[PDB]
Amino acid sequence: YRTTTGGMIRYAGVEVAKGGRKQGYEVTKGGTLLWIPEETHEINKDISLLIVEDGQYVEAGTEVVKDIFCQSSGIVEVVQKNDILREIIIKPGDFYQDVDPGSVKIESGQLLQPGQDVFPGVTVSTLSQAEWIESPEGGLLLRPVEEYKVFDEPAAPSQGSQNEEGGRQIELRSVQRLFYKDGDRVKSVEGAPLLSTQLVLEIYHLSADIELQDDEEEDCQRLQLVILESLVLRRD
């Protein structure tokens, strides 16, 4: 769950429940997950600083665009609104020669199976996504997707407490939390984590606790999320 570059994300049959779109979103069940990567560059340069065209395949040797070194390899795409560059969309993947551009536009939203073919005469190794570009003198591009395995519940250890459990009981829960939804892509080019196997507690809006390193069975340190109150004692 540590990709090289950013890109879009879309789940398939994964339900979620959240209360805020800032601090992630707690997942409920499992399911498959897709990831369509694309490198972005939110800059504010001019047009005369651009040395490439709209749909020029670059390599990983130098990859200098708008006097800025890139890290990926694919089809570049610039965004111009008012003579100022706004975003440099770089879509990685393989470039293959093809014809009949009126049929590759309808395959932009369908999942291309690896057992089938994208064109008669052109083969593909694994599953990808068809996309056509508007380059001078022309073929469409194939953007591969990445799949991962997520669990509905991770490996949680056995919790142990020593109390009467009368009116005050604490425990520890290990849940997974996703940060992005299906209808939103990330504006990043470096490594962005997708989830975080955290440890969220639920006391069953006050009574703060203090943890320390206390251990007596072995010669090591052990965490103890305990809660204590200091009582007064006069030295008299």
Partner: protein, 127 residues
């Protein structure tokens, strides 16, 4: 005063660069028009004279907008100089004279930000 974005510094620099060629024509014409080019408009060569004053007012407002909005950069630089000889009041007025000179010599074709180039001119006018 609200600060400028990264795309608004490029837009305002084009009208300042349009003001640089407008004052260069007047500086070349004042040596042969008896130093009084009030109505001598060489850029147009009732509708053309009104559009010339509209472009002159809009270009002077762009230079008015770039120096006035970047006044927080002068305070962040002059606060490190208010112990040697001068008070804090005289350093912002002298630092604002360098912000005016940085707005004329700012070249947006190089691609650098305005806060990178104006730091060299505010610190020069303070020193």
């Amino acid at each position: 005063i609200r600060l400028l974005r990264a795309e608004e510094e490029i837009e305002l620099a084009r009208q300042i660069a349009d003001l640089l060629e407008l004052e260069l024509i007047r500086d070349n014409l004042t040596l042969q028009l008896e130093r009084q080019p009030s109505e001598l408009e060489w850029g147009k060569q009732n509708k053309n004279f009104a559009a010339f004053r509209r472009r002159l007012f809009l270009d002077r407002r762009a230079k008015d907008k770039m120096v006035q909005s970047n006044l927080r950069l002068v305070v962040s630089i002059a606060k490190k100089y208010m112990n040697r000889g001068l008070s804090f009041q005289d350093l912002i007025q002298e630092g604002s004279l360098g912000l005016i000179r940085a707005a004329e010599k700012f070249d947006h074709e190089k691609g650098y930000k305005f806060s990178t180039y104006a730091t060299w001119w505010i610190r020069q006018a303070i020193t």
